[PDB]
Amino acid sequence: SALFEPYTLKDVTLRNRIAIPPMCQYMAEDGMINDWHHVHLAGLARGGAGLLVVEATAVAPEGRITPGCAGIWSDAHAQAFVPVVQAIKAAGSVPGIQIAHAGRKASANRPWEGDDHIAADDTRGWETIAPSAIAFGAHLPKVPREMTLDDIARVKQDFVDAARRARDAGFEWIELHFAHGFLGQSFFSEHSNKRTDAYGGSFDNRSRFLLETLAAVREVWPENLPLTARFGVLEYDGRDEQTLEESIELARRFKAGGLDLLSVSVGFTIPDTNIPWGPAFMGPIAERVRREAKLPVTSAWGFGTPQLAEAALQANQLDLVSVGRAHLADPHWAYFAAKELGVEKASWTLPAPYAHWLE
């Protein structure tokens, strides 16, 4: 099975091509993770996936999506990850982390607590920042504050510090969150970036925050560990061919700047779109990026059945298959997949105290 072939990137070898993508849990308190996360993550690692990427972890308090988001904006926050990292490694999975800044989509309620921008008089909320003072709209009506150059320098440094902390906590894989309408994506998109300085207008200027952040992170992140990013390569906003062309150009600049793998996603930059959700719908888009930027890729949003995952790999659309919601339903999804695909000794996807009995 292609799904169960190992994958080596830099000095890291994943035992199979199943990646668990970042999935916010909304269970942290002032950014500090706890036993929710410990058990959740260690349990997923034991389920057999080759790579487990920890949820969007904010580089700064105001860059959380919600009051429940994880953070890594101080050394104490970073140290809270150490036992989790160690548990993931003990289970034979590779520990990764997505470092993030929610930009104009920050200061929101948890998804089961309204999913909308927090009210102005709620003591939990905070001012959001973005490239331009323009609201997302819909359920996220807050107008963010337009960043100064000093704010840009500060946020870049926060990404550097977060990467250094992730390194020192023992993570073996990092993902910069430049997708999903959050800060990085919003610098790239003309919908959200109306700046007239060096950080807006032209393709080079809109790319600048992302490329400078990647370069700054690269200074502290080890050369021998995968340096990756998530990026929304189209919006489904009626501008897809032009947007894809630019996104692929940016992916070439990421590759030239040391990016080892790109997690290909959708922008979610604005609400007025028509995303064609369906099984493996991102496969052709991911394949195009892979081919035209000559960069390894992963993607998600509908690959969570064993045959879809296998087919995407065999067609060289993806290098890793990210499987999200199926792992919330069943932490041992990799074992399920091994069985489905007829892998020999499928139960030994799991550790001995499970595998022995499930042969």
Ligand X SMILES: O=c1ccc2ccc(O)cc2o1
Within positions 198 to 227, which residues make up the interface with ligand FMN, using CB under 6 A? none
* Under rule CB under 6 A, residue 21 binds ligand FMN: yes
* Under rule CB under 8 A, residue 266 binds its own copies: no
Residue 185's alpha-carbon distances to 25, 43, 130, 199, 208, in angstroms, are 22, 31, 10, 13, 12
Site string for ligand FMN, 115-154 (x = CB under 6 A): ----------------------------------------
Residues 338, 48 contacting (CB under 8 angstroms): yes
Least separation in angstroms between CB 100 and ligand FMN: 7
CA nearest 117: which of 143, 99, 151?
143
Site string for ligand X, 29-68 (x = CB under 6 A): -----xxx---------x---------x------------
Within positions 164 to 193, which residues make up the interface with ligand X, using CB under 6 A? 180
Least separation in angstroms between CB 164 and ligand FMN: 20
* Under rule CB under 6 A, residue 351 binds ligand X: yes
Which C-beta is closer to ligand FMN: that of 264 or that of 346?
Answer: 264
Residue with tokens 């999506």: 65
CA distance 195 to 274: 26
Within positions 77 to 96, which residues make up the interface with ligand FMN, using CB under 6 A? none
**Residue 236 CB neighbours (<10 A):** 16
Which C-beta is closer to ligand X: that of 178 or that of 209?
Answer: 178
State the amino acid at position 121 in one-letter form.
Answer: D
Residue with tokens 């919330």: 328
CA distance 146 to 131: 5
Interface residue with ligand FMN among 9, 28, 49, 56 (CB under 6 A) is 56
Residues 132, 195 contacting (CB under 8 angstroms): yes
CA nearest 22: which of 180, 259, 160?
180
Within positions 278 to 337, which residues make up the interface with its own copies, using CB under 8 A? 325, 328-332, 335-336
* Under rule CB under 8 A, residue 32 binds its own copies: no
CA 155, chain centre distance (Å)? 18
* Under rule CB under 8 A, residue 75 binds its own copies: no
Q: Is the dihedral of CA 279, 282, 287, 290 positive or negative?
A: negative
* Under rule CB under 6 A, residue 101 binds ligand X: no
What is the DSSP code (8-state) at residue 105?
Answer: G
* Under rule CB under 6 A, residue 300 binds ligand FMN: yes
Q: Which of ligand X, ligand FMN, its own copies, none has residue 21 at its interface (CB below 5 to 8 Å by kind)? A: ligand FMN
Bridge pairing between strands 129-130 and 145-146: parallel
Six-digit token string for 198: 């060096």
* Under rule CB under 8 A, residue 29 binds its own copies: no
Query: Which positions touch ligand X (CB under 6 A)?
Result: 24, 34-36, 46, 56, 90-91, 180, 351
